Design a protein around this ligand. Structure first.
Ligand code: NI
Length: 87
């Protein structure tokens, strides 16, 4: 049940011609910033982003999940936004 805001953030990234990678981390590895990707890297379509995020939320329920907007030129990380925290 993605919020309006989460979806707007997805659109904001894609509208820049940037690509989305979702990442997850458990509380222990959150301590050291040791995130890992979930799903396909460098998503370029909202449908794919929503599908992937919903999958990541289920698959890593209990972890942090965040969205990373990436400039395709040089794979520069532009923005990171936490979507879910541990429960
Ligand atoms: Ni839901």
């Amino acid at each position: 049940h993605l919020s309006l805001e989460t979806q707007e953030q997805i659109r904001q990234i894609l509208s820049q011609g940037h690509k989305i990678t979702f990442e997850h981390v458990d509380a222990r590895r959150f301590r050291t910033g040791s995130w890992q990707s979930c799903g396909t890297l460098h998503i370029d379509a909202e449908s794919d982003a929503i599908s992937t995020l919903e999958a990541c939320l289920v698959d890593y329920d209990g972890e942090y999940v965040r969205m990373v907007g990436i400039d395709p030129k040089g794979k520069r990380r532009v923005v990171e936004t936490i979507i879910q925290r541990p429960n």
